[PDB]
Amino acid sequence: MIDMRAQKLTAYGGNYDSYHKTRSELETNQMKQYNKQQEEIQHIKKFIASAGTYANLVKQAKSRQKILDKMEADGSFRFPQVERLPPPVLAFD
RNA sequence: GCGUUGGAUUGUUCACCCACUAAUAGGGAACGUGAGCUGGGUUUAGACCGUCGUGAGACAGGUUAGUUUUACCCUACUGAU
C-alpha cells in the first residue's frame, strides 16, 4: 500500500491496518524528535536571552549561539450529541 | 594677621551622631606628603558561600588569609668650620 500525504509516495507492504499502525509509529517518533529538538532549542535560547549586558556572559551565550546555529546547519469532524430521549424512538407496524 | 577640636560605628573620602568650644569655614600644593610611616581597603597566587554556566570557570556581590627594598652622590634645608 502506497500513500500520498507529504508529497512522497510511501510504499509499505501489507494492508491499511499495517500501514496505519506503521505511520502512527513514525508520526509518534518524529513528534518526539521534533519535541526534544524544540525543548533543547528553547533551553539554549532561554539562556541566551537570560544573558543581559556583561562581557563574560554575552561571550558565553555567543558561544552557545554558535552551538545552536551549528545544530541548525547540521539538520477532524464532530457529531453534536443527542437530547435526552426515552428508549421508545420509532414504531413501524 | 591669628585660630578652626575631643569621641563612638565604618578601610574610609564623604557621613551622621555625643560633647566642649569664641568658632567647629571651604580649599590648593603630581586629587601635597610610602628611599616619611602604617597597609584597614583595592588588586596576583590559598580558601568559603550565593547566583550564572554542561564544564574550565565568571561575578556588576559578600568573608578571611596575604612579602612593600637602597642614600654613603649632586642639590635644597637645618646646624658646623
Side-chain angles (χ1 to χ4, degrees):
Chain A
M1 184 177 285
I2 307 170
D3 193 0
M4 297 177 68
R5 68 190 182 277
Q7 288 84 20
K8 291 182 181 179
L9 271 72
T10 60
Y12 291 165
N15 55 2
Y16 180 73
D17 295 331
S18 177
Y19 182 74
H20 181 74
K21 184 177 184 293
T22 309
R23 182 178 66 192
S24 65
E25 288 174 353
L26 296 176
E27 284 173 352
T28 302
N29 291 325
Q30 285 193 0
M31 189 272 286
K32 289 181 180 178
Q33 295 296 107
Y34 187 85
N35 194 2
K36 291 180 74 68
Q37 186 176 2
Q38 281 186 349
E39 286 173 353
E40 189 178 3
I41 289 170
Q42 185 185 7
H43 174 70
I44 290 170
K45 189 176 178 181
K46 184 176 178 182
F47 170 65
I48 289 173
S50 296
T53 301
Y54 195 73
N56 286 316
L57 291 176
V58 178
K59 284 182 71 65
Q60 290 299 119
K62 185 182 260 76
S63 173
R64 302 289 174 87
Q65 187 69 254
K66 262 65 179 295
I67 272 93
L68 181 64
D69 299 330
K70 192 183 294 180
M71 186 172 72
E72 288 177 349
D74 282 327
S76 177
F77 193 74
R78 185 179 176 180
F79 283 169
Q81 298 297 320
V82 299
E83 189 181 2
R84 189 260 180 274
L85 190 66
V89 177
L90 184 67
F92 288 159
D93 195 1

